[PDB]
Amino acid sequence: WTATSGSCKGRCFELQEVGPPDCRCDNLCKSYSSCCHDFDELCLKTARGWECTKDRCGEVRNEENACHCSEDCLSRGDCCTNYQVVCKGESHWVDDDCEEIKVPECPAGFVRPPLIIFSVDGFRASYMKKGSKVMPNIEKLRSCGTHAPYMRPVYPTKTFPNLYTLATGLYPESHGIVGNSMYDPVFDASFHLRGREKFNHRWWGGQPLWITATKQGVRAGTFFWSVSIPHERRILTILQWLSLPDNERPSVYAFYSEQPDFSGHKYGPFGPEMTNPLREIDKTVGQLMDGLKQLRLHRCVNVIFVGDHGMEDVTCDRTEFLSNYLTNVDDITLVPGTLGRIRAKSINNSKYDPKTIIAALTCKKPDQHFKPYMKQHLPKRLHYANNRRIEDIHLLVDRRWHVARKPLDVYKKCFFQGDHGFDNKVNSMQTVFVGYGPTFKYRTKVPPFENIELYNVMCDLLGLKPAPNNGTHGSLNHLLRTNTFRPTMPDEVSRPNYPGIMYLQSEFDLGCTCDDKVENKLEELNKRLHTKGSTKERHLLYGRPAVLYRTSYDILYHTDFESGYSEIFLMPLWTSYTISKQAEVSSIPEHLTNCVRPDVRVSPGFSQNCLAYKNDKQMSYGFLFPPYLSSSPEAKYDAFLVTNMVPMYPAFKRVWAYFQRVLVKKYASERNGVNVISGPIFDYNYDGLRDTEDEIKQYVEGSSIPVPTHYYSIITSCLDFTQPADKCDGPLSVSSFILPHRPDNDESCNSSEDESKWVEELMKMHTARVRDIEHLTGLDFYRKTSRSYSEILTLKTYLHTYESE
Ligand SMILES: *[C@@H]1O[C@H](CO)[C@@H](O[C@@H]2O[C@H](CO)[C@@H](O[C@@H]3O[C@H](CO[C@H]4O[C@H](CO)[C@@H](O)[C@H](O[C@H]5O[C@H](CO)[C@@H](O)[C@H](O)[C@@H]5O[C@H]5O[C@H](CO)[C@@H](O)[C@H](O)[C@@H]5O)[C@@H]4O)[C@@H](O)[C@H](O[C@H]4O[C@H](CO)[C@@H](O)[C@H](O)[C@@H]4O[C@H]4O[C@H](CO)[C@@H](O)[C@H](O)[C@@H]4O)[C@@H]3O)[C@H](O)[C@H]2NC(C)=O)[C@H](O)[C@H]1NC(C)=O
Ligand SMILES: O=C(c1cc(OCC2CCOCC2)nc(C2CC2)c1)N1CC[C@@H]2CN(C(=O)c3ccc4[nH]nnc4c3)C[C@@H]2CC1
Ligand SMILES: [Ca+2]
Numbered sequence: 001w002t003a004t005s006g007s008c009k010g011r012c013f014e015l016q017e018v019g020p021p022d023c024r025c026d027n028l029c030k031s032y033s034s035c036c037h038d039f040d041e042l043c044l045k046t047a048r049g050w051e052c053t054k055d056r057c058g059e060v061r062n063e064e065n066a067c068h069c070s071e072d073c074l075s076r077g078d079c080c081t082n083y084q085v086v087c088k089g090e091s092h093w094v095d096d097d098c099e100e101i102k103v104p105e106c107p108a109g110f111v112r113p114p115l116i117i118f119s120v121d122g123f124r125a126s127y128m129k130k131g132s133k134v135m136p137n138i139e140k141l142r143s144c145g146t147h148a149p150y151m152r153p154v155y156p157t158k159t160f161p162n163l164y165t166l167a168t169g170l171y172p173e174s175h176g177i178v179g180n181s182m183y184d185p186v187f188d189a190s191f192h193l194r195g196r197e198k199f200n201h202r203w204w205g206g207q208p209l210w211i212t213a214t215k216q217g218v219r220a221g222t223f224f225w226s227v228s229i230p231h232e233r234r235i236l237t238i239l240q241w242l243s244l245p246d247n248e249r250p251s252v253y254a255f256y257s258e259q260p261d262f263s264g265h266k267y268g269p270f271g272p273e274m275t276n277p278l279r280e281i282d283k284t285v286g287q288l289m290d291g292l293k294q295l296r297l298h299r300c301v302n303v304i305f306v307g308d309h310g311m312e313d314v315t316c317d318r319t320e321f322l323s324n325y326l327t328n329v330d331d332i333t334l335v336p337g338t339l340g341r342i343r344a345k346s347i348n349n350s351k352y353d354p355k356t357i358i359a360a361l362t363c364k365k366p367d368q369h370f371k372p373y374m375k376q377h378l379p380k381r382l383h384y385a386n387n388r389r390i391e392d393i394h395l396l397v398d399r400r401w402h403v404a405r406k407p408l409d410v411y412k413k414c415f416f417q418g419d420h421g422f423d424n425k426v427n428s429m430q431t432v433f434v435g436y437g438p439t440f441k442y443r444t445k446v447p448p449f450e451n452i453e454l455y456n457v458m459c460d461l462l463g464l465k466p467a468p469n470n471g472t473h474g475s476l477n478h479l480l481r482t483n484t485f486r487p488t489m490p491d492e493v494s495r496p497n498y499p500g501i502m503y504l505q506s507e508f509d510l511g512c513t514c515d516d517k518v519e520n521k522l523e524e525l526n527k528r529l530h531t532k533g534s535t536k537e538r539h540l541l542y543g544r545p546a547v548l549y550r551t552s553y554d555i556l557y558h559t560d561f562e563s564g565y566s567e568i569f570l571m572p573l574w575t576s577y578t579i580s581k582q583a584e585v586s587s588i589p590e591h592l593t594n595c596v597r598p599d600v601r602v603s604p605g606f607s608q609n610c611l612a613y614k615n616d617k618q619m620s621y622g623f624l625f626p627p628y629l630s631s632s633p634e635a636k637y638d639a640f641l642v643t644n645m646v647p648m649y650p651a652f653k654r655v656w657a658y659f660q661r662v663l664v665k666k667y668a669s670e671r672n673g674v675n676v677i678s679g680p681i682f683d684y685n686y687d688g689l690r691d692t693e694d695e696i697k698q699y700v701e702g703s704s705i706p707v708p709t710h711y712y713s714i715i716t717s718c719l720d721f722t723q724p725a726d727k728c729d730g731p732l733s734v735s736s737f738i739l740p741h742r743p744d745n746d747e748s749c750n751s752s753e754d755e756s757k758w759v760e761e762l763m764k765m766h767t768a769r770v771r772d773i774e775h776l777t778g779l780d781f782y783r784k785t786s787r788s789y790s791e792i793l794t795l796k797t798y799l800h801t802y803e804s805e
């Protein structure tokens with residue numbers, strides 16, 4: 001109930017919300033049907049429009065006007081934004097040369113530079129270049145401030161998941177807003193764009209910026225605007241709030257624009273009708289900046305111009321229909337469009353089988369424009385699994401396409417020419433970032449980065465301590481002139497053992513055999529020193545990884561590689577080796593094909609055994625350091641140590657063999673040497689975090705050898721490729737992956753062809769940040785470099801995307 005009887009007089013755009021049934025005058029009241037009767041008349045004035053004209057100058061205050069051109073307007077803080085331009089001979093902000101803002105130039109009483117976050121829905125990254133002639137204010141912010149060529153949204157590249165990620169620093173799986181549409185089985189409730197359920201606080205996890213600010217005594221301007229409130233009024237309201245007394249004035253403000261998304265959907269991302277909305281967004285930016293300049297705030301405020309996602313060309317005829325694949329199509333619920341989520345229509349139907357649904361959707365048509373996944377098999381870089389609101393069965397839809405259940409859904413719902421929601425690596429989904437202000441750098445371009453990082457930076461801009469989040473705090477320090485955050489490296493929790501020769505061959509009863517009874521003081525002091533770590537500076541370029549949890553592990557040295565061997569998981573946590581440009585690929589000799597050798601430094605009790613693999617009809621084994629890249633016939637024997645062995649399905653060995661035999665050498669050739677760190681990952685509960693031993697769901701049959709869910713590699717070289725990887729003087733270059741360890745290659749539709757036609761594409765799909773691998777393994781890489789820690793943090797967040805220019 002709303003008793004709409006009270007009044008908005010002197011309460012227009014009030015900052016604290018008041019409790020029903022007392023009527024409301026805040027910027028959200030319309031959206032709750034809760035405004036006082038007089039809200040429109042008092043708060044939403046329009047008379048005379050939004051601009052002063054020559055003859056309105058020095059007029060007598062008429063309170064009915066939308067904005068004022070009277071003499072007192074300045075000190076009332078309610079001039080039209082162009083007032084000083086029309087009436088006092090001033091220039092537009094956009095026409096002034098830019099001048100470095102070395103320090104905040106703020107009115108007396110300002111305790112910190114304010115922050116204004118100007119967010120634009122559907123603003124595709126390439127609009128910065130392609131619409132540059134029609135957006136002169138935006139181009140001035142961009143070229144004078146700090147900008148990235150684009151910013152990576154989160155998956156799915158929808159409106160609510162991305163806006164709430166900007167607010168929280170959290171993946172949608174952690175913040176809970178996993179789509180624009182959702183079913184929560186615990187609540188038995190549904191979240192939709194249209195309607196009231198979305199207002200209930202139980203949907204919204206984490207801690208968004210406005211709450212972080214409030215709890216720490218920073219005042220927040222109410223972030224959200226009822227859709228009917230026009231843009232000009234939002235700007236004037238912000239400017240008016242900025243005129244409040246010190247004790248009442250907020251420090252952080254939000255403006256949201258529905259454009260260009262709204263038009264992008266109707267006309268496609270580059271439709272000729274898209275010029276106008278871009279012009280209009282720019283004009284609004286101009287009004288803000290002119291408004292700030294009038295208040296002498298234009299060298300005081302930090303302004304963020306940020307998009308939630310881009311926009312792709314998508315039409316009704318590019319729809320796949322599940323009714324073309326599925327016989328039981330009425331027994332499923334589909335969340336449709338640019339992604340697919342499938343569950344059973346009814347939980348009482350015990351004949352619903354996800355396994356058979358997946359198989360029926362897998363590689364069925366030569367040009368199929370979606371791929372089905374169990375959510376835990378999605379590329380780990382999407383971080384899209386650990387939420388009860390994310391259905392077990394997911395469809396990754398090709399860019400430019402839609403998925404629907406039945407054709408009736410598409411014509412009883414071509415209207416639209418643009419959409420978004422695809423894989424967040426897709427170029428058309430990239431969006432924008434521009435920071436302008438005393439705290440951002442001057443005329444600086446920064447590399448692309450992910451939107452999950454910005455919450456930390458907005459917290460830094462306001463002197464707040466961020467709630468725990470998925471950003472890597474410090475990885476965006478290179479955006480900022482000051483207020484940087486100086487993190488320390490995490491402390492190593494477990495130190496390694498350095499075992500020597502402690503066991504005799506005959507103590508091993510592993511069912512392993514090797515043709516190695518093949519016989520000198522020159523090459524014997526030599527093998528001793530290699531086992532003591534004489535070549536360790538060659539293969540361990542950035543120090544050993546730190547183990548950040550309690551465990552028992554050993555460092556093992558070899559001529560060609562170094563490993564940290566886990567006595568608990570019976571395999572390395574990591575294996576590190578360097579392959580120079582000059583290195584040679586060799587094959588495994590025939591006498592060594594099934595050779596597995598006991599490691600005399602590690603107890604039988606802490607070793608794998610060959611018998612488990614013989615018994616396990618599903619499971620085979622591979623090696624972390626590839627025998628193909630051994631430096632010499634004698635060094636090759638080290639690669640067959642039982643301590644370099646890891647469990648691998650035969651289907652995954654195809655993937656692994658090609659990577660190790662062909663790709664490593666190829667990268668060394670292209671990058672002038674590479675350092676490689678490889679290892680297993682165990683993520684049975686798909687939370688993106690290292691499993692403890694009691695979480696492991698699968699072992700090699702009859703043994704305690706745990707089966708990894710994934711294998712990672714981190715491939716580092718010199719950013720200046722004219723220097724070799726092992727003698728690099730400056731910044732580094734990295735690419736990494738987290739390959740799912742699967743008993744089949746159903747994911748790759750062309751897997752019956754030669755590995756040369758499908759493996760690299762699979763790896764590219766499962767590209768990863770080093771930081772993703774840190775979460776998954778409890779390890780911390782690049783501990784010993786000459787580089788600044790902030791720069792290392794930036795490198796650890798890098799994602800090699802494999803999209804063109
Ligand atoms: C991205 O960053 C985020 C933030 O840093 C990371 O997520 C954190 O990871 C922590 C480790 O998994 C996790 O810690 C757990 O928290 C439990 C209490 O948590 C509540 O309080 C916080 C603080 O206010 C709150 O934010 C949480 O909010 C979640 O839950 C509500 C729903 O109730 C949602 O609205 C909200 O969106 C959020 O959901 C997300 O997280 C949960 C898990 O917490 C998921 O299940 C959801 O899918 C969703 O993703 C909470 O309200 C605490 O009870 C846990 O402690 C257990 O485990 C420890 C091990 O140390 C042990 O000491 C205890 O015994 C205890 O076990 C008991 O509970 C078990 C489960 O019932 C049971 O089996 C046992 O036998 C015991 O009874 C634990 O410490 C933290 O909550 C989240 N935070 C957030 C915001 O998600 C995320 O990891 C990062 N991602 C990556 C890839 O890096
Ligand atoms: O006020 C907002 C808002 C702005 C915002 O800011 C967060 C800032 C954090 C700091 O960093 C900067 C951001 N956070 C949110 C939610 C997440 C908490 C909402 N909205 C008004 C319009 C409504 C109507 N919508 C639609 O009707 C709609 C719009 C576009 C669509 N595309 N496809 N479907 C669509 C449906 C979208 C819906 C949400 C957007
Ligand atoms: Ca886990």
Ligand SMILES: [K+]
Binds near residue numbers: 619
């Ligand atoms: K086997």
Ligand code: NA
Binds near residue numbers: 747748749750752
């Ligand atoms: Na296949």
Ligand SMILES: [Zn+2]
Binds near residue numbers: 122159261262265420
């Ligand atoms: Zn949209």
